[PDB]
Amino acid sequence: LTLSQLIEPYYDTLQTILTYLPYTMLGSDSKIFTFSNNYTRLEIPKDINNSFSSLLREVFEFAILYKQLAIVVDRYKGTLVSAIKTAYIAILEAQLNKYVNDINNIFNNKPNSILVVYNSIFPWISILRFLYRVSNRLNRLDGYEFLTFIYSFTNHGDPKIRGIAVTAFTEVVKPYYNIVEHWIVKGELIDNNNEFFIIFDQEQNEFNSIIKLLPKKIPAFIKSSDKIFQIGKTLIFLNKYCRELKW
């Protein structure tokens, strides 16, 4: 007889866990694990002795965090108006899709114990924690403060954290570069919200002062800003006052 058999009579606890664990990991209610309080806490049932409960408390960190991220993604999918936050939500959805596929792989290969499950998903601790922390501040932070907040993480020394930060920053910053593209090429302003270093003044009654620069909002990753402003102003002047549409 193996070691695990001789202990069976003297050790009582509810493979059955692995039967209902995949449904709990995907942020869904289970016969033995039930969420409560708007999916902010998970109740471990009776008949799970000290050790297994202590181990599960580490595994269930992924389930609750993923459920919170899924709630955020489903809630703010098409409600936010700012382009920066929308791009952030897009990349967040992509990351969650990868996580779900990873879980499906971990449980397609029938696992032997809870520990192999924990080890398989272990590399996702930093990604999930970072995404939860950033999404937690999607409300108070404005369109530009959010971009600056993410940008500060691209310098993180940790390859995993900096990898996810620089992965998300590309798509988060693309809309800003689209604003700059429209301003540079045609000479027009797109951002309806205050998330750019060039603005207008409808109340003004003279050309040279309708457009003004905001030196405080100039991002660090942009270059030759004082030339971008002049290019855009001269374009507006040419295509709306001189009416030289051909050139």
Partner: protein, 292 residues
């Protein structure tokens, strides 16, 4: 009483989100008394089952945390918990277990070290070291999984085999990482009453200068950890640009206050001769030369 796993309420980007300072007051399922069992094989299997969870830092039915371990204190978490073994275990099994328990202490200490020292205020060197610690933990769990598989299917498995396997496989690297981490904790708590990691590794490496495997591991760790510092130095000497805003780099360029901008623009000599400095604290012995 119901059991709940609830969400807890320079930001710590890797600090545990859920509550983990919960210590169970009494066992949820009352197991057999250890004194009641007299057979040696049964005791060995029971202690093995309890030990698999202990090695990850969790409590068991027969291995319990010492009353001195307070999760609130930072130093207590960093140094890891101390375990007490039930008095009714067999003497030989008790000794062998007391040797193996230390591995759970190191693992818990490293896991709590990551959740504290991996933020922006501790610099790129410490962050990159936390990366190594997290990769080592991932490797160590594959040593624990194999042990569990052998316990489950191998009939010849016994406590001595576990002791020999763990000691001969993972003891050395774990000891190195834990010692470096605890030394960093001691130094950083002393300084409150960054680039210092390289000094700790170099100081640590003097004692293992004759040991091939330990020297190889320490040299590899030093090489990967220092790579960020080499990046800063390379950019400084090739393009004259300082990049990382953590003030880690030795050549400290400082911003002129807005109140004096007009003054410093006129007298650019003082701008270019006073607002570039050399941070002597973070210098290695290679750069400890005036002309260099």
């Amino acid at each position: 009483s119901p059991d709940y796993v609830s969400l807890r309420e320079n930001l710590d980007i890797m600090s545990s989100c859920i509550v983990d300072s919960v210590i169970y007051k009494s066992q949820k399922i009352a197991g057999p008394l250890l004194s009641q069992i007299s057979n040696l094989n049964i005791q060995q299997a029971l202690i093995i089952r309890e030990l698999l969870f202990t090695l990850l830092g969790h409590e068991g039915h027969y291995i319990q945390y010492s009353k001195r371990y307070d999760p609130t204190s930072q130093i207590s978490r960093i140094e890891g918990p101390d375990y007490k073994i039930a008095k009714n275990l067999d003497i030989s099994l008790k000794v062998i277990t007391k040797k193996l328990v230390k591995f759970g202490k190191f693992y818990s200490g490293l896991k709590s070290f990551i959740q504290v020292f991996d933020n922006n205020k501790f610099g790129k060197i410490v962050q990159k070291f936390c990366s190594e610690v997290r990769k080592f933990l991932s490797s160590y769990q594959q040593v624990l999984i194999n042990v569990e598989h052998e316990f489950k299917f191998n009939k010849n498995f016994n406590l001595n085999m576990l002791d020999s396997l763990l000691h001969q496989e993972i003891s050395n690297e774990m000891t190195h990482l834990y010692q470096i981490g605890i030394e960093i904790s001691r130094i950083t708590e002393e300084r409150q009453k960054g680039g210092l990691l390289l000094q700790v590794i170099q100081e640590r490496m003097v004692y293992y200068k004759g040991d091939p495997t330990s020297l190889d591991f320490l040299t590899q760790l030093f090489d990967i950890v220092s790579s960020d510092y080499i990046g800063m130095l390379n950019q400084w000497l090739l393009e004259g640009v300082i990049n990382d805003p953590f003030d880690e780099f030795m050549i400290r360029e400082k911003r002129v206050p807005d109140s004096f901008m007009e003054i410093f623009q006129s007298k650019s000599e003082y701008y270019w001769n006073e607002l570039f400095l050399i941070k002597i604290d973070g210098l290695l012995n290679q750069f400890q030369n005036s002309t260099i």
